[PDB]
Design a protein around this nucleic acid. Sequence first.
RNA 1: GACGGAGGGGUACCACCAGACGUGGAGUCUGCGGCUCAAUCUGACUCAACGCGCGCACCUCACCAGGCCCGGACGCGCGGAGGACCGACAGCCGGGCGCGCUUUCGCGAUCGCGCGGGUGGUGGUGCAUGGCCGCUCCCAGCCCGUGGCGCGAGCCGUCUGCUCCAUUGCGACAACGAGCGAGACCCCGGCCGCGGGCGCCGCGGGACGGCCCGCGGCAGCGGGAGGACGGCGGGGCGAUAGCAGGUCUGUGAUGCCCUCAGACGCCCUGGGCCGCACGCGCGCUACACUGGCGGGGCCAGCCGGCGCCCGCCAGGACGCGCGGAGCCCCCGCCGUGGCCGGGACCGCGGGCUGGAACGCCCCCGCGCACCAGGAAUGUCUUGUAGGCGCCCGCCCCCACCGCG
Lengths: 101, 151, 210, 138, 68, 50, 107
Amino acid sequence: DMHQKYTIIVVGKDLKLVERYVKSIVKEGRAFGISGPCRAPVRRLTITTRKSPCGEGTNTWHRFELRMYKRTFWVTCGGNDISTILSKTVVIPGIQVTVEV
Amino acid sequence: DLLERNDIEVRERDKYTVHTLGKKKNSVAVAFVKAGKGDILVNNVPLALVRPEILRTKVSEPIMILGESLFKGLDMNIKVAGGGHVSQIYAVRQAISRGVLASVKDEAARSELRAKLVSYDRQLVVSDPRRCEAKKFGGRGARARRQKSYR
Amino acid sequence: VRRDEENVYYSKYLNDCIMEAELHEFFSRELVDAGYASCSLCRTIDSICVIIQCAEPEVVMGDNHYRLHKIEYLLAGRFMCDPKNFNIWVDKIIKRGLSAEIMVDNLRAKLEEAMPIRRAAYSIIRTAMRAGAAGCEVIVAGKLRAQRARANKFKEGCLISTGHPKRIFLAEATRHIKMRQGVIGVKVRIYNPNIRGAVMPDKIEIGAFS
Amino acid sequence: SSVTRVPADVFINSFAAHLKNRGIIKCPAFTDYVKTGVSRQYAPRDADWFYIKAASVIRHFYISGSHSIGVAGLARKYSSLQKGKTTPHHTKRASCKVIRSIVSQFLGQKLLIAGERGRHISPNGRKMVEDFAEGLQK
Amino acid sequence: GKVRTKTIKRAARKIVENNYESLKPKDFQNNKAICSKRNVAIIPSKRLRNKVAGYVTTLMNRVVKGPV
Amino acid sequence: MRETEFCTHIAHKRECRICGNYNSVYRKYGLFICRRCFKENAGKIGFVKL
Amino acid sequence: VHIPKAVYKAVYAHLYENASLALKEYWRVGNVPGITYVDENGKLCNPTYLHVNCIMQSLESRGVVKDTFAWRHHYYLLTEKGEQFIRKELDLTDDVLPTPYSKPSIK
RNA sequence: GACGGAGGGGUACCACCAGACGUGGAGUCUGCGGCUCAAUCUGACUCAACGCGCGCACCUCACCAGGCCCGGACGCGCGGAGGACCGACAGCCGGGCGCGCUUUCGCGAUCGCGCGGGUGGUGGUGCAUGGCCGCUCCCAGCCCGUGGCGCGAGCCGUCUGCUCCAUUGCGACAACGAGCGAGACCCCGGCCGCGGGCGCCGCGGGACGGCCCGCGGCAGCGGGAGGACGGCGGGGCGAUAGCAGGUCUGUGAUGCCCUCAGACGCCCUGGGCCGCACGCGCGCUACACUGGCGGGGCCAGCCGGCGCCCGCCAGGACGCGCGGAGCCCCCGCCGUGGCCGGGACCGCGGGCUGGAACGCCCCCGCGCACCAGGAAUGUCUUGUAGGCGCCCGCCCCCACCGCG
């Protein structure tokens, strides 16, 4: 079995959604020698816009921040086994799964 | 520089027996102790060597108040990353003093000896909650604003 | 420390979020009248699987299902989608009184035909009040009747308009119905104290000795 | 180690006096005319500025060692800011040509043998520079 | 000092009298864990619970000192 | 015809993405969305006031 | 205004086949992807955004195609009344069906 | 209700006091006012306008000087296909654009008209009005049911006691129960634990006014110790009610009203907002001696790539993916000299990038004012003031600005 090393990376806005997808990949992978999950440093996406559409008033500013957390899972398996794992993993719509060979 | 695995990343083998953290003003100094021949070197650098020479006298405070028999023989290798310059020295001072405390270990009243050092210097065993604050809209600095034209 | 800060996908994920805002706008453009309430696309397997949570699913299919994937086909010109690779999950949204965007359409569509503004708003308050919502804000504004704001607010419950938890039990729906005189603005709100997946901070249930 | 125990100021000043007897590097004329940096107010008056810089690069090099320091790297040890403008000063680099000569000349003496991303000391040089430090402390 | 709202004191008042059992009179530690049986009250955040768990130590102390 | 000088100028003609406005493109992260336009479309992209 | 009859008839067909169009509006010179055609010289060419809009608007103005506008985009949804008029221009046949006419049913 | 050179209490470095750094005085810059111009596009104008509407060589761009171009959809009435439209080498005019000429060439209803209608528009009215925001507001009040009191306007609870930043409570009360604000909640630290991990990063817990002593009807209230931390961490979200506050000049937010093809439509070319006594509204750098200027020990936290080779740099080539501040601290050089203080104005070059400098940087002149700032002002109590640097927003170019 040409055991390729696959790096699985998950970037998602909500910590509550991210932990659930992370748990499924760890849960599905106990049979396939899965390395434990790597938590990324939070990726801040701050945007600061003065709230007022017009220029009136002491410009007050909206700091709008989007937090990105990415999760690294190393797996040594066949090309099919990740596909069998896929049916079991609970798919949250819009969360990203990245297969890095 | 920032909370890494730099705690022991630099040294491989020769496991240094003691690991003691010292922190002042965003400066991290993990103290590694091997109980050698009077090596108090921190940052792989001599105690006498310092950024401010005058400041070194403050970092010799456990040495003067606590028995010198402790510093007479010891071994040290400290990874200090972060801090402007003087932040590093107090963090170093927190590290080494806690490192001497970790060495005392077995005597139950280790705290009683250490408190002579707290009485002479408080915060020599304690970490301050003082951290930089933030600016707000209309403010050049954290606790100011653009000078107001009309009351 | 050895990984590129040029992580290309880190930018890609936000592109999906503008895709989500564009999808929200896409369905807001005419499918909000068809009932569109909420959207979620899935490009993880390049399925482009989109859930259109909507008040009534049958409107887009019509009578032949011809336009059902035409919405995906409209996205096909934009994103090279294939009919059936992409999917539209237009399903049933229950307790539509809780839904806000279409609830306020239900009211300003009635006000397009022209009917007592007070009466129309009051019936809207009751049909969501029936759903267990103590307060629904039928805030209207704009050039109402006599020229001026003549803003009228209609509220029936203890809605918290302030606080981080406020957004949990509340929704906003910005809607404008244009009389020949001009834009009449309506912002709507809803009450959900019993979230059932989380707890309102103030709610102390209490207990007894026996 | 005693190379970390020789204070940086003492190491650098003492090393260049025998480097003067050595005849190593050979500081060129245009470099001793030019003012170091693109932010310096006016030329340093050290006269033997190039020779004194040469004792400055190879000491910081001992600590850098295997990781390596490129041409920008030694300019970093002496990085300064302009002190004369009506508007505020944004930090800028020192002169690249003078720095490029100091470690390129050091490659020539075989104390520094480099072939990696920018420059590394030949072991013979690391040992010899450390040996000058061995003389300096004790 | 700290002064809390009617609901916060009233929840504590309900907890100390309507389910007295033996909430602690002078000790904070039992009180810290005796207010979380789930049925006795449901509220989010440890500190919010701790607000009831603060007054309860005085209310039970008051009852021990004399009738409230 | 007009094609000879038609839009001959070559320079950025960048516009706000959601709107047709030209100012405040705000291409910080490649979001070519508008600034006044951004307030109407921030939560959907995942940014929040916190 | 010179709009090729080959640009016209092939363009009508692209819209007819998918019953859809999503174009970021372009004020002036543009090339619309998804629609390609054959010039009098036998060259494969793509049409122009200025020209395409002038026909797109005309078919929604005829009422043959329903259209939406989301700030700077045209979303075209073809009508059944429209399909008959498209056949009256393309010289194609009634049996031919738009590709989304059926098959998106989800169980 | 609102006022009050009315009283009785509260409270806030937007109030003040003990202090601090200021600003106003100096130069310089940016934004106004006021001028000038073909044109200086404009909105704002006490806090709550005036480095603000997210970086004008062009575009933006609103304005000025010049011109091209239709993009007058859809229906009928026409004109009418070898005749609707539309392109054109030279010789031009003309920066120029086959625009329109001389020209002699190509097209092929794809359409031109007439109408009715669509047609855009940073064009007016924000006292048509949406949305959103400024303020009232370092600021706590709001209202409902039932019952009371009043012919009623309204009262009562919602309070002439105490406490709290705060109807914040605790007591007491023709009110009695509810609520919405404030709280709670959320975001980041003070610390630790569990799983882990590359990127130390996800999940829990924990300082509770808990306890001590004094007072407290009691709520609270000081003095205290343990203790990561003392009784909100640094932040956000913020009631009812308003304002004829601001924005039609962000918009598929738009009403009325205008310009609708010699256009207020839309493209090009050159302007202008970078003009401009004095006056201002922020800023910035100075006046040196805790300062210089000095080589030469350095040090970060935002969270960030480097190498090599020529070139003083500016930069340029050739490449590989990879990495950090200033002040200060060093020894020195240096007399109180508008100084080797300061860095202006401005000759001479080297470049950058851009269609294009009128943008900018570096090198080398040069050494403006200014030698401690009059009234009158601000802004702030610990990691705070100040001092000193980094990054971003915009942007080919360019920060003194702002968020950090």
